[PDB]
């Protein structure tokens, strides 16, 4: 990596290394009652909090916070789902504690057709043996995607994402010189990740029908 690239990675890692489930939440995962409604509530709190952590992490991505203070909204709005599912893949592969979180996820009003692809994606991520740098850079890349629905200035976003893609590529060559297609593999996983925008929207539909309540922030980002 060049020094500018090491600098970029060092700051992304400093911030990404601050992400961790709050203890009060962890405690609830262990002791709260077990029911569809309760499980949804626990998940809704973890999600609301994670959107807040994403906001902060994004605010630190270089150049981001100098973009049209609205094309910014397009990005966070557009990437929240993908970032959360990537984060969850990371945690289910690290581990149990998460053993319990899974049992709650499996009885939270999520239809079996979406449970299936969620756990298969986790297994597929587990397979790539990703490093923290890879999870951090991929999340940054997910957030800085130039294809979001409301992107006016797609070219500017493109400019800020490029350097990250470049850093990831070099990292893959450095830490897996004997697995040259690793990088391509990570990019393919980003593709499977995008299908969660649809899975998640179907989950929102089932939950709404089933009369669940979200959170002011989540209602905003997902238009409920």
């Amino acid at each position: 990596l060049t020094p500018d690239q090491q600098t970029l990675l060092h700051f992304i890692m400093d911030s990404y290394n601050k992400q961790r489930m709050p203890q009060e939440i962890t405690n609830k995962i262990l002791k709260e009652e077990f029911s569809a409604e309760e499980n949804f509530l626990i998940l809704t709190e973890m999600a609301t909090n994670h959107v807040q952590v994403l906001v902060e992490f994004t605010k630190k991505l270089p150049g981001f916070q100098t973009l049209d203070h609205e094309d910014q909204i397009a990005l966070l709005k557009g990437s929240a789902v993908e970032a959360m599912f990537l984060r969850s893949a990371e945690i289910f592969n690290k581990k149990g504690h998460s053993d319990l979180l899974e049992e709650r996820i499996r009885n939270s009003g999520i239809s079996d057709e979406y449970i299936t692809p969620m756990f298969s994606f986790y297994k597929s991520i587990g397979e790539l043996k990703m490093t923290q740098e890879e999870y951090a850079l991929l999340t940054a890349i997910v957030i800085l995607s130039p294809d979001r629905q409301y992107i006016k200035d797609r070219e500017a976003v493109e400019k800020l994402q490029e350097p990250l893609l470049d850093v990831l590529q070099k990292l893959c060559k450095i830490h897996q010189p004997e697995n040259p297609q690793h990088f391509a593999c990570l990019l393919g996983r980003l593709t499977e990740l995008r299908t969660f925008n649809h899975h998640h929207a179907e989950m929102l539909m089932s939950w709404r029908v089933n009369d669940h309540k979200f959170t002011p922030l989540l209602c905003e980002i997902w238009d409920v």
């Binding site: 906001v55 605010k59 203070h69 609205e70 910014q72 909204i73 966070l76 709005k77 922030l217 905003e220």
Partner: peptide, 11 residues
């Protein structure tokens, strides 16, 4: 937006 809160915490 409209997405007041998101605009908010995005200081």
């Amino acid at each position: 937006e409209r997405h007041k809160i998101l605009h908010r915490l995005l200081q």
